[PDB]
Design a protein around this ligand. Structure first.
Ligand SMILES: *[C@@H]1O[C@H](CO[C@@H]2O[C@@H](C)[C@@H](O)[C@@H](O)[C@@H]2O)[C@@H](O[C@@H]2O[C@H](CO)[C@@H](O[C@@H]3O[C@H](CO)[C@@H](O)[C@H](O)[C@@H]3O)[C@H](O)[C@H]2NC(C)=O)[C@H](O)[C@H]1NC(C)=O
Lengths: 49, 50
């Protein structure tokens, strides 16, 4: 006589993303020798990393 | 008067198909609709009778 199923799930699940960033040198933008003025604030993008 | 009788014949053994069974899928409700979701099964158990 059918009793029930069993929705097993050992060690839940694993979350995986690719290897570490590539072309994200945040240091030279944030530890830069060259900063900007407040009215002349710079604008540079970070992308694909 | 007229008739038609075969002098000889043939044994035309051929195909014939009568599909017997299917996939007796015992599709449950609390998991098919609600996979790893206590919320979905909670909502579906009051439907119940379905
Ligand atoms: C009715 O038809 C059969 C055979 O018919 C064939 O098979 C059917 C399933 C259908 O596909 C038909 O379209 C197809 O033609 C006749 O049988 C034949 O009989 C003759 C002799 O009566 C056989 O000849 C033989 O020859 C060897 C050679 O050495 C001799 O040694 C034998 O003693 C014999 O004489 C023949 O092989 C056989 N099969 C054929 C022709 O395919 C059947 O005779 C016919 N009925 C009448 C009344 O004609």
């Amino acid at each position: 006589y059918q009793t029930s199923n069993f929705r097993v799930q050992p060690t839940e699940s694993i979350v995986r993303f690719p290897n570490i960033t590539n072309l994200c040198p945040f240091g030279e933008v944030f530890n830069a020798t060259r900063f900007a003025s407040v009215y002349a604030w710079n604008r540079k993008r970070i992308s694909n990393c | 008067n007229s008739i038609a009788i075969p002098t000889n014949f043939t044994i035309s053994v051929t195909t014939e198909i009568l599909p017997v069974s299917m996939t007796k899928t015992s599709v449950d409700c609390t998991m098919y609709i609600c996979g790893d979701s206590t919320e979905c099964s909670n909502l579906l158990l009051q439907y119940g009778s379905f």
